[PDB]
Each structure stands twice: as C-alpha cells, then as structure tokens.
Design a protein around this ligand. Structure first.
Ligand SMILES: COc1ccc(/C(C)=N/OCCC(=O)N2CCOCC2)cc1OC1CCCC1
Ligand SMILES: COc1ccc(/C(C)=N/OCCC(=O)N2CCOCC2)cc1OC1CCCC1
Ligand SMILES: [Mg+2]
Ligand SMILES: [Mg+2]
Ligand SMILES: [Mg+2]
Ligand SMILES: [Mg+2]
Ligand SMILES: [Mg+2]
Ligand SMILES: [Mg+2]
Ligand SMILES: [Mg+2]
Ligand SMILES: [Mg+2]
Ligand SMILES: [Zn+2]
Ligand SMILES: [Zn+2]
Lengths: 332, 327
C-alpha cells in the first residue's frame, strides 16, 4: 500500500501527509484517515523521506511488520498515551531534526536512534503515572526498583518486539552500529522521565551558555556527550510540545490528558488513596492547570531550546505564548 | 553436630568468622543461621515485631534462591557479606549513629544483594543479549534483578518479615535497600570511592569521636560504602578464608570464560583458565580496587579498621612474594 496501510482514500491521506515536515501536521486526521494507524503511516513516510531503508538496508515489509506490531502495543483505551501520541512525538522529532541550526550535525544512525526512540518511548503505557505504580506496589515498580519504572518498561518492550517474526529492522546494522544505536535509544527514552526534567533543563541551560556555532548559526557538537544531550532534550521537547502546536491540536491534547488523569484519580479514590495533583475530576481547574504547566515546565524548556537553535524556534515560542493566553482567557 | 555450630556462632561479632564451617555444620544453611543469630543478637525481632517463624521461612526461601552450582556468588557469599556488614555496623566511630531501621536495611540489603546470581557478569549478560540485560536496559542488570527477587520473595506465604513495620518505615527501608544494593555494581565503584574520599576530607566528629551524619545523603553514602566494603572484604580475611574465596571466584570466572570461548567471544580478563595467574590477579585486585577502598574506609573510621587493613596489606605482600620481580 502507498502509505504502509490500507485507507478508504489515500488521496486525502496524501494531502495531509504533505505536512509531515511541518509543525502542526493534522495528526488526529491522519489517525482517522489511516484506520487508526498514525504511527505506522507517519514512520513509514519519514523512513522513506530520509532514505533510511536504503541507508540501513531495512526491508520495507520488515519495517511495516515491526511498526504494526509496535502500534498494536500502544493501548487503544488510553486517552493520551496511545499510538497517536507516539506518532505525534515521532513527527515532532522529525521536524526538530531538520531545524537549520542542526544541518549536517547528526549522523544517519543518530537520526535513526532519535526517531526510533520517539516511536517506542511510551509503548505499553497503562495510563497511570510512575508514582501511581509505586504507590500501588505494582509488579512493574517491583521489577524496576521504583526508578524510571515506565521508561525502563517502554524500552524493554520496544526492543523485545524486534525479536518477533520479520520485525528486526536493525538486522543489517553492524554489531557496533547496533550497540551504538541501543545505547543512544536507552539514553533518550530514559530522559523522558519527568523526574529528570529539572536536571535535564539545568544541564541544557549550561550547554546553551557555552554553545559553539559556525558563521551561519549551525551548532558545533564535539563528542557523544554533546550529541546525546541535544537528542535527549530534542525528544523531551517533542514529548512536551502539545502547547506549542496550533491551538485546535493543543485543545484536543488537553482534553485527552485530562481524561487519562481523571481515570487515574478515580482509581486512587476507589482505593482510598490521596488523589494525585490534577487527577480529581471533582476539583479540577483544567485551564488554570494548563497555564501553570506552560509557566513552570513548557515555556522554560522551549525558551531554552529556542536559545540553542536561535532563531529557528521563534514561531513555536510565539504560538506557545498565544496558546497560554487562550487558556488564561478561558479560566472560569 | 549442633554443639559445634553454637561454638562457631560465638564468633559472629568478630571479623574472620569460619563461615565455611558454619555452612557445612548447618546443612548448607549459613545464610539462615547467620541472619537468625544476628537478628537475635541485635534484638531485631522484638524491635520490629518480626515473628520468628516468618523470619525463618523467608530466610530459607531466600537461601534457596542462591544457586548451589555457582561457585562464588552463592548463599555462603551472602552469609559472609551479612556477617561482615554486621561487624562494620558496630565500628566504634559509628556508635549510636544509625537507627534500628537503618541497621535492618543494611543487613537485609546484604542478605539479598546477590540473590539468583547466574555466575556471569553484567558485561557478559549485556554482550550475549541476555533477557536480563534486555529487561534492565544494560544498566546495573544483576543488581536490579537481585533487588527485585529479594523483595518479590517477601510475597511468598508467611514470608513478609516487614509486616509489622509502619507504612512509612516500609517505604524508608525499601528505598534504603535499593540504594545499597545498587551501589554494589562495580561499574559505580570509582564514583563511590571518589565521593567517599571527599566525605572523609570534610568529615565531622562529635566529642566522643563518633562520626556526625546529618542528612539522608550522608547516612546512605556511609551504608553504601560499608556494604560495598563487606562485598569486597575477602582479601582482608585470614589467609585460610581468603584462599577459599579465591578458589571459588576463579572457578566461576573460568566457567564464564569457557562460555565466551565456546561462543567465539573475546575471553573476559581473568576468565581464561589457560592464560591467567591467580597471584598476579589477586595482587592487581588488591592494588587497584580493594586496598584503595579499604584504606579510605580506614581513614573514615580511624583507627577502628587498622587490624583489617593490616591483614589486607599482609595478604597482598604474601601473594606478591612468589611473583618474580626486579629488585
Ligand atoms: C496537554 O497537556 C499535557 C500534556 C502532557 C502532559 C504531561 C507531561 N503529562 O505527564 C504525564 C506523563 C509524564 O509524566 N511524562 C511524559 C512527558 O514528559 C514528562 C513525563 C501534561 C499536560 O498537562 C498536564 C499539566 C497540567 C494538567 C495536565
Ligand atoms: C576472592 O577474589 C575476588 C572476589 C571478588 C571479586 C570481584 C568483585 N571482582 O569483580 C571483578 C573486577 C576485578 O576483579 N578487576 C577489575 C579491575 O582490575 C582488577 C580486577 C574478585 C576477586 O578476585 C578477582 C580479581 C582477581 C581474580 C579474581
Ligand atoms: Mg546524508
Ligand atoms: Mg512517557
Ligand atoms: Mg542481512
Ligand atoms: Mg561541545
Ligand atoms: Mg472540597
Ligand atoms: Mg553482586
Ligand atoms: Mg588452594
Ligand atoms: Mg595503594
Ligand atoms: Zn510521551
Ligand atoms: Zn556480592
């Protein structure tokens, strides 16, 4: 099939996929047009556009088989942490990687690692937080000793699915390419644990203070530490990009995260536990909480990214400020 | 003979307990016997309302999950690390420093710290694409697994020894045990040592000469290094014990090297039965790992550990004495 899956009209899906290189791709429409296969469709498109199948000798049927299997392990009944979110983070990383300040900085293997990490970074998410898994003595928290419980699990699942029949998209990488990619993917997905956000941002501010740049604004990264730190922060920014998107996308993302949070709070309430912050549907201030989220997490991060790639992210920052105003203006 | 076993257990508060003798006399139950003795000695059953039958049931199932056919990383090693931690906890420089819950965490951590060890290193598990390294993303693979198994066994029938701890105590113990067992990963050794050296530099002592450890970070750092020292204590023991430990670790390493050889892999250092010297390997282990750590522990608690450091230095001089050297 043209776009990796069957669709009732590829012509509409093709028109939408022309925005795969743009911030604010219509990812919910892509999900509908692809029969709920946005992750497979978007990954297929990106791998073809970046010529990654030829570079890494990835058979296209192997790519599609792995992507379908991976997409199937995102839960259909989780409102936010599902295959649409995975597709969104993939596509947002794909746009961030093309930013002019990063031209020719990353190798094809680093690009592959960032995209693959984005695709697997929330797989098999149960719709509850690490702290909920710890507080309820879950098997997952027992397995992972309360540390980056979900993020360790997403990695283990995403790598394990490579072992299924006709799913090993890395079969033609060399042994050291495989080792390098595995290390980068682990480093990137572990950095999506929000318990690491403050340290990650503090370190990113330090890199920005000492950035080295060519005449035309292209960053000069010196070693693995520099490269992986930019990739970690890139995928973290993509994971935290909802409020920087066109407002209709952001509004839907907010509706979905609140649905998932409220379902967690209901589980907490039913077990007599303290309800987690922003998970009480009976005592919620959705609009206020979005403004607080932007003020304390999203704008500090994106203003630092925008500094790193100046001026590449100026419109993203401007959209963030407009979207902050939307939620401020709709506080009851 | 239960008579001789009680005599051997008389030395449970001394460095150099004959743990191999206790293993034989107890019917291969050194971990159960030594944990029970130490829990009685420290009055831990009464402090934490641990039913004695619950303790024995948990300890027997924990001991069952150390592998008999692993020559070094088995229940005797667990029992040795427990008893060594038990001695280090009573060092005069740390008198009345640690709470009973901190003491319980350090001893429990020692007891579980190598459970279900397969007899191969983290690097081997990573390099062979093992399921354990896949589960744990190549990071403290075995130590994460030891923790998960040791805690999981608390769920077995009549095995929850922490059942009468408060919720808060249980959460604190769990955190402390995780922090301690993860610090036994040798890839963290240089960072642990660099930080311990700096803690020694700036250490604070009471009048009485006892260390002052104000917050959790300083307290847990001392417990981490203290169990790491116990894990690395074999060369500080009397030569007749140290020789037995050296035999066991080389058997285990050589079996890993045989698997690497069968697989066409580069044999890990010190794992080639054909091209390795015991003496050079032990002198190197002492010079580059064990003595740098123990001289720093000895600095922290000076002069409490001088006899331990004296034995270590004697054993190093002993094992280097048959290696030809320029004079
Ligand atoms: C559109 O609104 C939101 C979108 C996403 C999120 C996040 C970050 N949710 O975190 C849950 C998963 C999580 O913990 N992660 C994954 C991302 O990076 C950090 C680690 C939060 C949102 O708004 C929240 C804050 C105000 C009340 C609802
Ligand atoms: C009774 O003997 C031993 C007990 C325990 C261990 C441990 C914890 N080994 O961890 C491997 C790292 C290691 O040993 N290194 C790496 C850096 O250079 C020095 C050597 C090692 C023991 O002796 C080993 C070394 C001598 C031959 C067998
Ligand atoms: Mg190129
Ligand atoms: Mg996540
Ligand atoms: Mg091939
Ligand atoms: Mg640099
Ligand atoms: Mg009220
Ligand atoms: Mg160990
Ligand atoms: Mg001998
Ligand atoms: Mg020295
Ligand atoms: Zn995510
Ligand atoms: Zn050990």
């Amino acid at each position: 099939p043209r776009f990796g899956v069957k669709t009732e009209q590829e012509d509409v899906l093709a028109k939408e996929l022309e925005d795969v290189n743009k911030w604010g791709l219509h990812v919910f429409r892509i999900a509908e047009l692809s029969g709920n296969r946005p992750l497979t469709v978007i990954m297929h498109t990106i791998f073809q556009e970046r010529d990654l199948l030829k570079t890494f000798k990835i058979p296209v049927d192997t790519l599609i088989t792995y992507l379908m299997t991976l997409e199937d392990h995102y839960h259909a009944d989780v409102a936010y942490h599902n295959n649409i979110h995975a597709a969104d983070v993939v596509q947002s990383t794909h746009v961030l990687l093309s930013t002019p300040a990063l031209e020719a900085v990353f190798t094809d293997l680093e690009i592959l690692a960032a995209i693959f990490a984005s695709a697997i970074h929330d797989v098999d998410h149960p719709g509850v937080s690490n702290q909920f898994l710890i507080n309820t003595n879950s098997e997952l928290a027992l397995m992972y000793n309360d540390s980056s419980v979900l993020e360790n699990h997403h990695l283990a699942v995403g790598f394990k699915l490579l072992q299924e029949e006709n799913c090993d998209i890395f079969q033609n990488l060399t042994k050291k390419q495989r080792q390098s990619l595995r290390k980068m993917v682990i480093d990137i997905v572990l950095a999506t644990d929000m318990s690491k956000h403050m340290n990650l941002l503090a370190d990113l501010k330090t890199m920005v203070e000492t950035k080295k740049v060519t005449s035309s604004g292209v960053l000069l990264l010196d070693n693995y530490s520099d490269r992986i730190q930019v990739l970690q922060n890139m995928v973290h920014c993509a994971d935290l990009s909802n409020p920087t998107k066109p407002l209709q996308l952001y509004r839907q993302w907010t509706d979905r995260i609140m649905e998932e949070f409220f379902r967690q709070g209901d589980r907490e309430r039913e077990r007599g536990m303290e309800i987690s912050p922003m998970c009480d549907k009976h005592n919620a201030s959705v609009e206020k909480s979005q403004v607080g989220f932007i003020d304390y997490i999203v704008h500090p991060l994106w203003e630092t990214w925008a500094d790193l790639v100046h001026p590449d992210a100026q419109d993203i920052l401007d959209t963030l400020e407009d979207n902050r105003e939307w939620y401020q203006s709709t506080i009851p």
